[PDB]
Design a binder for these strands. Structure first.
Ligand SMILES: Nc1ncnc2c1ncn2[C@@H]1O[C@H](COP(=O)(O)OP(=O)(O)O)[C@@H](O)[C@H]1O
Lengths: 99, 580, 100, 81, 111, 88, 100, 97, 111
DNA sequence: ATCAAAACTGTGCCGCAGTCGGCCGACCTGAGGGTCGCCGGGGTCTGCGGGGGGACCCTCTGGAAAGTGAAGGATAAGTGACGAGCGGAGACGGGATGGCGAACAGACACAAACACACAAGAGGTGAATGTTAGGACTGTTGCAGAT
DNA sequence: ATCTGCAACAGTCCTAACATTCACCTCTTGTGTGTTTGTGTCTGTTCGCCATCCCGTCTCCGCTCGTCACTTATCCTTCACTTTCCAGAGGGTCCCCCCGCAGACCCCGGCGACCCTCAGGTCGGCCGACTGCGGCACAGTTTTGAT
């Protein structure tokens, strides 16, 4: 069947369901391997409490959700719909984190 | 006794002014007595007392002191000063470098007198643009000049110009701005350069404060610092009624005369010209009203006993209500003024009692002020009732200032009450055509007296001056009046000192000193609303009496409503305890 | 468990449960939300007492009083929260001082 | 542990952007957000391992992560104190 | 001797003024700690906790729930403007965001 | 009669168009629209309101009526806007 | 000699160079003092100030407005423009945190 | 009026300046700025060491807490050199007297 | 008899900041209950390092401008050109300081 | 692809606040020398929980293929901001005139710390006791995409 | 206007996550009485700021206006994005092991707090006072705007 939605409908329904839900969105084991690698840069034989890894995950995902909110504002300001690397760099410059 | 000690000070260091290029000793040790003027003074004769003051100042030059000419308004300081200048030019052959200093409101008049009375002396002015100042800068850096006119302001603004020249003899005018020892102009003149011969010139004695000290005892003579730095308050210890001030410190007052012998000259206007007839001074007592009473006496309680420094605002409660404009939003919030809303101040009720009869009897009136908003709201009434007037203040831009005298001194000048300010004008009004000078609020000075009277007391006052110094019952205006008047007629002693600091009738320094100490001992005697008395103290002759009684009949056949407004009710509770 | 003295650590949990049963008689709270209310109470406590410490060192006192805590409330809390918080604090300290 | 940053899968970043409210995404967002996430984690984990190395432990804990986040500026409620 | 009066009961509060007083005492905030200051502070804290829990319970009423969850606290906080200003730099864990869509991203009403 | 104080130029609009342009051209701006003036004036108004209500609170706590340099510096320090130079 | 007017932009660029090259104050002292005293009059009606208090507020507010125009210049250049408008002053304050 | 001594790091900033640039003077208001800078970094490092004391349940601010406060506050290369300077001076202080 | 009241603790470590004043400020500043005898030496050496780094970088900014007196413009240029000093003083506004000569690339017309 | 017209930029000189070096006053704070509670640190034990390995199962990622719809470049009408000139005008110095508030020095009763006694309030456990959200399992309408 | 496809509700269903007692341990907070020092109260001095006006001297802000470089609306093309489907695979869950290790006691010296002197490093006004430096003045490049 040629029942393919035009782009925009499925995008809005994922906007609705992922703002209505509350769970984590990055997979727990690859996030954990990421954290243990980055911490292995700084110290050899560390050990991670699971609440420490999940605290890192809550912090990182609230950070990236807020950053994409500001990139959505910058992309709408530039008369676009598509977010781009130039406005990720813009929000991380106006916010303070880079320059 | 330290007068002989100051005589020893001046006897020790009286040699500096003749090396560096008794007080009956110091004013009489050298003499030269020529009553004849110098030859090149053109354009009118000298009076003999002008020659007396000139000869005294020539002796001040030859005693090499630093003199003070301090006589009264309208007695010719200018011609005496330029006569000194031309006598010191030709008859001594030193040919400057001369400096002078005037206020800018008189520099045209001083340059006019420099043209008319000494054409041999070239006169540089300093005004206008930096272009004109740069042209005369390049002119003066070579040394081709005799007289350098400049104002107060270009001394500091041309520091380098008038400091690289070794000055000889400055003569500066209007010394009651030169008084302040921490005035920046005074600091630049003291740390300017050692200029040799300096003269204050003034029309007033010490004012506003303590005796003469900070102008004449300090700036005019530098050695008096070395002889005064601890004894200043010791001489100032006269600063309660009979024993201290009158009985035992009469010797101290005589010692102040004794130390101010050789330096002043205050010849009174009563002696020689005397063309001023008189000054009929009365006081008039206004009152509160339904808001200025217990309504505002509630606000003394519920504020202090909000606005900062209420002593300033307590002037505003007795001048006029709703100059705050917040209570206008409760009494007349409909923003339209009429009868018995403007008029509610008791001073203003006294105005529209007294003013229509001088409109009838034809008294031309000057009115002075502080607090220019009172001038504005009086002007609002003055367009309300529509009687003719003008207005002058610190917003006349100097051209309308020089213009407006032609409007008021017309023979058909239908404008009668010329509203003024007490500060505004700077001794340039020159107005003889009034005969009634009322005063709303007394200042912190007798300069209100010694200027606002002299505006109408010029050469040509051909009526009697009727003064109505307003006051209100038990407001702060009375403590302003008694404070300024009593403890700033310290110069009752000095206005007595003028005659024996002048021509010197020998009985003036004891007998009439006692006769004015009579006025200094009727303190408690002088310290302790009816149409008859108030309408006679403005009256002059009997046709005025008949027409004032006729105007009383004409506003008695008319049924006055009442006097003013009564205490309306809920806004009286609302203005005080609901502000915050 | 064999006796090893499980170490006591305090919280605000019973007190938050008291206040919840005041303002809602019929609503339970979750465990994770109890931990969020606990960390919130510690956070607001540490902010207010840190600001009162800075006022004590600025004015060169050496004593935290009701006035330094009142001024820390007026600094940290916005608007209508600051108004009702000052009202509650002054009411409780006068009910403390007067009554007993 | 070789190049684990690509364990942040492409639909994971697309899901975080859908929570953020992004309707439509570029194709160069992916390496860029992986760089952004790596910088943020390097800062937080450097500060939390500083707290742990001071405490003479050999274990990152929930309190160390919370303290690192708090002194960075990102306060985190729900993991004790 | 009396029996006992907790200082919380004297002031009419719910929070532990004794625990507040020892925390102000040995948290190194100043040397001397007054005796009305822990009462004032416990009052402030009881107010803020009552406010947060009231708004969270109202949101749990709105979602037919009788157990108050971190989503409910997030909704209460970020929907009240003043608590949003206070908790501006704060990540309530298991929060999610406010349900919010921009107005450009809606589909074309005419097509 | 102009007896009210309704007729005078208001004090917030006294922050002039060329002074806003000098802060802009110091900031780096090359070309400025015409509604920047009202917007920057509103921004400055709100920022001064925050700092001056903190400085009034510090002053009233210290029991005085003279807002001082150290009070404004402490207010900016808790705004996050730390200022050197004036707080010794 | 009257037809020597610069291409529009050139005077703006030499203004940019002189005002970044110098370090004075740019808002003038008397009207900024009157604005400070007015806004303080909205809180405590009877204050007094200090010359260094008003100069501290002026240093703070001018450095704030310069940082705001740097960030609004970045936002305007991002929007393929040169002329800054109000919508990106509001964007700079929305992203930075000062608005919402 | 018993002129009240208000002390600062003015002469100490001056000593350091005359070490690292022997022919340069410093203005008055730049001396006020360097004073405020030293007091600012003092308050930050002392606040972080106090926080470390309360986090370990330990009552004493020592060199270990100041070292961790420097590593938590300073960026990168400044952190590494400042920790080196401090350990240098504490070994010279403990060894010599 | 006092033995030798000399050799202040600044002189033993060879520092130039007052170890005595730093110890007194740490002690009565009420940061913690008690203060070791090496912590203000360590801290004073750290503050010597930071003052030395900024004053050296500002000396080399008051040499380009041909001016042997450090005014606040020079401290602004030194601080905001060293990137680590810029990240340490990121929120700080050095008074009477001015900003850096930054003109964006798209602004200045060349084509 | 050359010249008029302004605009910085050196030099240089000349007064001017303003660093700065002593001067000693003149202290008030730091160093040293003793005493002694007390806290931190070395050392042992021991549950405990984090690393790791493995089995299994399945939802969720990778990859490609088709359509298509916004991104971007080119174009042009429109207007709004910029450079410049000119004439009022308000900042800026300086003044007058009191008046007050804040910083700075002694005396002192509220008040907060100390330190014991003791009981009762608050954690830790547990154990039913419900119970309440969660999780498949289906009925049933509201938005979307060619009809 | 009608198939159709996620998505919100309607009513069971294990289970697990809270909420009540419970006795209970313990440590922690009132209660109450010596006690001492930090905070306030008033008296005097000084100096900087406030409510009002003045009086000049200017750079500088406001208004007009000509002119053009910009912002924005339209259109066309095109490629980078979404949507769908479908094969596979690592993430999730359970469970088991298995030692490093965090934390709790225990005991004992170093060490920092407190105190008491007492000499001198630091502030700090004067006292010039030297000079580094802004503000005019004069030649000389050095870009821009026409051409
Ligand atoms: N000998 C004289 N003959 C005529 N007029 C004279 C003579 N001496 C002085 N005057 C008048 O004095 C006036 C100048 O006086 P002035 O110096 O202004 O007095 P004051 O300083 O007291 O106001 C001149 O206008 C002039 O008319």
């Amino acid at each position: 069947k040629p029942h393919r939605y035009r782009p925009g409908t499925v995008a809005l329904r994922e906007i609705r369901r992922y703002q209505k839900s509350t769970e984590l969105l990055i997979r727990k084991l690859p996030f954990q391997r990421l954290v243990r690698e980055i911490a292995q840069d700084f110290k050899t034989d560390l050990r991670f409490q699971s609440s420490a890894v999940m605290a890192l995950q809550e912090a990182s995902e609230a950070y990236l959700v807020a950053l994409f909110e500001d990139t959505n504002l910058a992309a709408i300001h530039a008369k676009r719909v598509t977010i781009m690397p130039k406005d990720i760099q813009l929000a991380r410059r106006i916010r303070g984190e880079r320059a | 006794l330290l007068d002989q000690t100051k005589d020893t000070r001046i006897t020790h260091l009286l040699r500096q002014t003749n090396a560096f290029l008794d007080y009956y000793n110091v004013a009489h040790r050298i003499k030269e007595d020529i009553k004849k003027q110098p030859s090149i003074l053109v354009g009118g004769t000298l009076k003999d007392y002008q020659i007396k003051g000139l000869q005294w100042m020539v002796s001040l030059f030859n005693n090499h002191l630093n003199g003070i000419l301090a006589d009264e308004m309208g007695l010719g300081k200018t011609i005496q000063t330029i006569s000194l200048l031309t006598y010191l030019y030709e008859m001594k052959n030193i040919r400057g470098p001369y400096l002078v200093i005037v206020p800018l409101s008189t520099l045209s008049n001083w340059s006019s007198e420099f043209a008319k009375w000494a054409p041999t002396l070239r006169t540089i002015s300093f005004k206008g643009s930096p272009n004109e100042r740069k042209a005369k800068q390049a002119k003066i850096r070579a040394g081709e000049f005799d007289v350098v006119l400049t104002t107060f302001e270009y001394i500091i603004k041309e520091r380098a110009l008038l400091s690289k020249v070794k000055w000889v003899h400055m003569i500066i005018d209007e010394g009651h701005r030169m008084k302040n020892a921490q005035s920046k102009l005074s600091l630049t003149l003291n740390t300017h350069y050692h200029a040799d011969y300096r003269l204050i010139l003034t029309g007033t004695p010490l004012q506003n404060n303590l005796p003469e000290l900070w102008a004449l005892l300090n700036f005019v003579l530098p050695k008096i610092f070395n002889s005064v730095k601890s004894f200043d308050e010791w001489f100032n210890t006269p600063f309660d009624k009979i024993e201290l001030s009158e009985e035992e410190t009469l010797l101290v007052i005589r010692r102040l005369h004794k130390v101010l012998r050789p330096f002043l000259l205050r010849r009174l206007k009563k002696d020689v010209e005397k063309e001023l007839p008189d000054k009929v001074e009365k006081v008039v007592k206004c009152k509160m009203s339904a808001l200025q009473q217990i309504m505002y006496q509630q606000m003394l309680k519920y504020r202090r006993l909000g606005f900062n420094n209420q002593i300033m605002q307590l002037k505003k409660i007795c001048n006029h209500p709703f100059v705050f404009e917040e209570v206008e939003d409760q009494i007349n919030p409909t923003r339209e003024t009429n009868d018995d809303i403007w008029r509610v101040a008791g001073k203003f009720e006294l105005l529209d009692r007294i003013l229509p009869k001088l409109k009838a009897t034809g008294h031309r009136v000057l009115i002075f002020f502080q607090m220019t908003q009172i001038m504005d709201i009086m002007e609002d009434f003055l367009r309300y009732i529509n009687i003719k007037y003008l207005r002058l203040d610190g917003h006349t831009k100097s051209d309308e200032r020089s213009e407006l005298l032609r409007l008021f001194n017309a023979p058909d000048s239908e404008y009668l009450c010329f509203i003024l300010s007490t500060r505004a004008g700077g001794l340039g009004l020159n107005l003889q055509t009034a005969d009634t000078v009322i005063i709303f609020d007394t200042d912190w000075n007798p300069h209100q007296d010694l200027q606002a009277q002299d505006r109408a007391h010029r050469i040509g006052q051909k009526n009697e001056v009727r003064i109505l110094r307003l006051i209100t019952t038990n407001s702060v205006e009375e403590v302003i009046l008694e404070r300024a008047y009593k403890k700033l007629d310290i110069d009752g002693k000095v206005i007595q000192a003028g005659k024996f600091d002048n021509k010197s009738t020998s009985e003036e320094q004891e007998a009439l000193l006692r006769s004015l100490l009579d006025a200094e001992e009727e303190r408690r005697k002088k310290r302790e609303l009816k149409d008859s008395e108030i309408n006679e103290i403005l009256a002059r002759n009997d046709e005025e009496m008949a027409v004032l009684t006729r105007m009383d009949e004409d506003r008695s056949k008319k049924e006055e409503k009442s006097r003013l407004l009564e205490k309306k009710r809920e806004e009286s509770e609302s203005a005080a305890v609901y502000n915050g | 468990g064999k006796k090893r003295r499980k170490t006591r650590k305090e919280s605000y949990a019973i007190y938050v449960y008291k206040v919840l049963k005041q303002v809602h008689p019929d609503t339970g709270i979750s465990s994770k939300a109890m931990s969020i209310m606990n960390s919130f109470v510690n956070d607001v406590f540490e902010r207010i007492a840190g600001e009162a410490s800075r006022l004590a060192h600025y004015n060169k006192r050496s004593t935290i009083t009701s006035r330094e805590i009142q001024t820390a409330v007026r600094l940290l809390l916005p608007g209508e929260l600051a108004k009702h918080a000052v009202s509650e604090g002054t009411k409780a300290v006068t009910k403390y001082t007067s009554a007993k | 542990l070789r190049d684990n940053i690509q364990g942040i899968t492409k639909p994971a970043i697309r899901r975080l952007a859908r929570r953020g409210g992004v309707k439509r995404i570029s194709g160069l967002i992916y390496e860029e957000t992986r760089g952004v996430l790596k910088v943020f984690l390097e800062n937080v984990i450097r500060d939390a391992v500083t707290y742990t190395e001071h405490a003479k432990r050999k274990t990152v804990t929930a309190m160390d992560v919370v303290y690192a986040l708090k002194r960075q500026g990102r306060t985190l409620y729900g993991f004790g104190g | 001797r009396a029996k006992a009066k907790t200082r919380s009961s004297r002031a009419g509060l719910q929070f532990p003024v004794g625990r507040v007083h020892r925390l102000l005492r040995k948290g190194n905030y100043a040397e001397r700690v007054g005796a009305g200051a822990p009462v004032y502070l416990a009052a402030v804290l009881e107010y803020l906790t009552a406010e947060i829990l009231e708004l969270a319970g109202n949101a749990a009423r709105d979602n037919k729930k009788t157990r108050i969850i971190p989503r409910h606290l997030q909704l209460a906080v970020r929907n009240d403007e003043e608590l949003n200003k206070l908790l501006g730099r704060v990540t309530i864990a298991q929060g999610g965001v406010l349900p919010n869509i921009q107005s450009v991203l809606l589909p074309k009403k005419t097509e």
